[PDB]
């Protein structure tokens, strides 16, 4: 008889709300069975009771490490259903803050993985940069993480007059922080022994098990949604896609570090190419008018009233919209019935498929190896449980 | 366009093998990591002296709600219930009636701050800048009931924080 | 920063790079917290004439999906959902890490 162990939810390496039932022979892991739903809030049913604008903060709270990216995916789905187009400056702002959000998420992922394995120091070094990016969020929206800035017509407000300079100041220094992190981890033999050939997944198994993002690219699969199916302005920025060779934790760590570097590159390009113009679609039946117009113009007041009480109507239909979120492929299957409330909203999170395959990746490994494998999948249970 | 992260093999020169052996036997990478930690030890820490020093904020910051007035002292709120209709959490409850002078004013204005998600949709919807999210964020209570705000509490919050709320509005209403 | 020169040399030697060039703390190069007011231009539809809403209303151009092969009712080469994806290029900027 094997030993049966509860790993979490009250466990430092359980990411809060995971109940991993493990069957162990000694310390060898014979079986992993993840019990989830300890953070299931019934988000989709609640969304069915809100208008399209009211449902937006739910996507903030879905993956609370990548907020603007969830907002962007939801907004792209709603724009596709509405047959409208955001203005170019809004698209550049969206891509800039999506890359900043990618930096935030990759910092969180790498530092928490190192903390779980035992390297407690880079967490503190990189969370100061995370704090500065939270300051950027708060300056643009008034909230440190739950901005609700990206809307299904563009963005809520324009950038404050000194924000681009501060973003440039942060970006010209972030590379040295990445360099210090790599000096800490990249060539350390303890880190490599903990990560090399751990959680090895083949390309075919990754494709069949529904993996996406880094979980694919570490196995050598040359795939990235921003390159193959670009959405906002990603066809106007130049960056490189890191590709793994061994399919293990070490290759995924290297891929994430290089993706942080590439996000810095894209942020530079977005900073240089920010255009002028309006920030939300010039269609007052979808985007609210300015406050000065609402207090002067009868049509503007009527449309403000109707947009903030009933909302805009979305023509009947169904869409599946996916983006390259920092954790993989984040998708929304959105069904509208012609009303101002969504009929059905199914959220596809990469964490669901990645966690459904934890048992496969943990075969023939120890307890510490399973901790490393949980860390390398970049799991946030707000999006897994919904 | 893609690049490889881990597709480099090492040189088989005798001297290169000697450096690798010296690194294995003498732990040069671990000394490098210790040096990084030591260099961080002599840097100035990033800690601030709370509560005597505060983290930076912005005029757009969303915090404790308040009900505002016109300069004459009359309440701005006219009980249109736009904030109540837009609230994603259904945290606002409003009851109104004609006032003694016939003005259209609320009799109940409640915000459940344990339901509120602090999104600020209410102050975007409001046509007269009546309800706002203030700059205060240090209002933790010792009981749950203290976080169920009624109209008296919100008007008191407005009267208390107006000198800052108005100045914050002045610096951001041109972006709105 | 306000560090002594010898401490700066020790930090630079321990880290292996020049720390004073890129400080994590922000002293004075940041933007001022009081800014002049903006102007925020208007969108393309703010014209006074030739601006009828029926010419710029995307929501009404949306159509129900076009039915292909309803079941209620030569060569003929095979087809694919799209042309094959092109092979990627190997990073002239930096091909190997």
């Amino acid at each position: 008889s094997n030993l049966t162990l509860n790993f979490g939810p009250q466990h430092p390496a359980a990411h809060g709300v995971l109940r991993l039932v493990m069957e162990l022979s000694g310390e060898m892991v014979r079986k992993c069975d993840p019990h989830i739903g300890l953070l299931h809030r019934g988000t989709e049913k609640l969304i069915e009771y809100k208008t399209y604008l009211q449902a937006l903060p739910y996507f903030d709270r879905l993956d609370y490490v990548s907020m603007m990216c969830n907002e962007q995916a939801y907004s792209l789905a709603v724009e596709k259903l509405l047959n409208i187009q955001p203005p170019p400056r809004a698209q550049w702002i969206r891509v800039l803050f999506g890359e900043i959000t990618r930096l935030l998420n990759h910092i969180m992922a790498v530092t928490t993985h190192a903390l779980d394995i035992g390297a407690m120091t880079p967490f503190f070094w990189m969370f100061e940069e995370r704090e500065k990016m939270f300051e950027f969020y708060e300056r643009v929206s008034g909230a440190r993480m739950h901005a609700a800035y990206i809307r299904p017509g563009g963005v809520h407000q324009d950038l404050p007059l000194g924000l681009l300079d501060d973003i440039y100041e942060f970006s010209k220094n972030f590379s040295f922080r990445i360099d210090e992190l790599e000096e800490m981890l990249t060539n350390n033999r303890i880190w490599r022994n903990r990560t090399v050939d751990i959680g090895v997944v083949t390309a075919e198994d990754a494709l069949n098990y529904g993996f996406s993002g880094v979980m694919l690219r570490g196995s050598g699969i040359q795939w990235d949604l921003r390159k193959t199916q670009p959405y906002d302005v990603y066809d106007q920025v130049e960056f490189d896609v890191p590709i793994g060779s061994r399919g293990d934790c070490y290759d995924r760590y290297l891929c994430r570090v290089e993706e942080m570097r590439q996000s810095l590159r894209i942020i530079s390009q977005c900073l240089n190419k920010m255009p002028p113009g309006e920030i939300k679609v010039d269609d007052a039946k979808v985007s609210p008018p300015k406050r000065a117009e609402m207090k002067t113009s009868m049509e503007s007041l009527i449309h403000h009233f109707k947009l903030y009480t009933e909302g805009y109507q979305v023509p009947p239909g169904a869409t599946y919209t996916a983006i390259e979120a920092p954790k993989g492929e984040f998708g929304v299957y959105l069904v509208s019935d012609g009303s101002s409330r969504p009929y059905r909203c199914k959220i596809k999170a990469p964490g669901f498929a990645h966690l459904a395959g934890l048992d496969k990746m943990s075969k023939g490994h120890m307890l510490a190896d399973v901790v490393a494998i949980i860390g390398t999948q970049d799991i946030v249970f707000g999006e897994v449980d919904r | 366009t893609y690049k490889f992260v881990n597709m480099r093999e090492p040189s088989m020169d005798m001297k290169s093998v000697t450096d690798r052996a010296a690194q294995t036997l003498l732990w040069t990478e671990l000394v490098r990591g210790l040096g990084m930690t030591l260099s961080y030890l002599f840097r100035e820490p990033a800690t601030i002296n709370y509560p005597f020093e505060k983290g930076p904020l912005s005029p757009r910051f969303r915090g404790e709600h308040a009900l505002r007035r016109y300069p004459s002292g009359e309440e701005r709120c006219i009980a249109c219930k736009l904030c109540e209709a837009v609230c994603p959490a259904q945290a606002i409850t409003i009851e109104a009636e004609p006032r003694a002078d016939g003005s259209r004013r609320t009799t109940r204005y409640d915000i459940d701050m344990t339901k509120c998600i602090y999104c600020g949709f209410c102050q975007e919807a409001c046509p007269v800048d009546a309800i706002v999210e203030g700059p205060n964020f240090e209002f933790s209570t010792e009981t749950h009931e203290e976080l169920l705000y009624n109209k008296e509490k919100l008007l008191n919050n407005g009267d208390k924080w107006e000198a800052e709320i108005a100045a914050n509005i002045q610096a951001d209403y041109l972006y709105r | 920063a306000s560090a002594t020169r010898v401490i700066q040399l020790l930090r630079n030697w321990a880290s292996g790079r020049d720390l004073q060039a890129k400080l994590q703390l922000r002293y004075q190069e940041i933007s001022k917290r009081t800014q002049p007011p903006p102007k925020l231009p208007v969108g393309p539809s703010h014209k006074l004439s030739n601006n009828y809403y029926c010419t710029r209303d995307g929501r009404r151009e949306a159509m129900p999906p076009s039915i292909v092969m309803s079941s209620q009712k030569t060569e003929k080469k095979a087809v694919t959902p799209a042309p094959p994806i092109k092979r990627w290029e190997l990073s002239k900027d930096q091909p190997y890490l």
């Binding site: 324009d158 950038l159 404050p160 007059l161 000194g162 924000l163 681009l164 440039y168 970006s171 010209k172 590379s175 040295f176 990445i178 360099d179 790599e182 000096e183 990249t186 570097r261 590439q262 810095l264 590159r265 942020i267 530079s268 900073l271 240089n272 920010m274 002028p276 | 001297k15 000697t18 450096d19 040069t28 490098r32 | 292996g16 790079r17 002049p36 007011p37 903006p38 102007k39 925020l40 231009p41 930096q94 890490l97």
Partner: peptide, 29 residues
């Protein structure tokens, strides 16, 4: 009469942002 004021990059552009990995050799034989 005043012109449009908006948050924009300076005339020309920003200076280059370093992103490539940097690790010096820093060792004896």
């Amino acid at each position: 009469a005043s012109k449009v004021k908006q948050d924009m990059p300076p005339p020309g552009g920003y200076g280059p942002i370093d992103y490539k990995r940097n690790l010096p050799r820093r060792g004896l034989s």
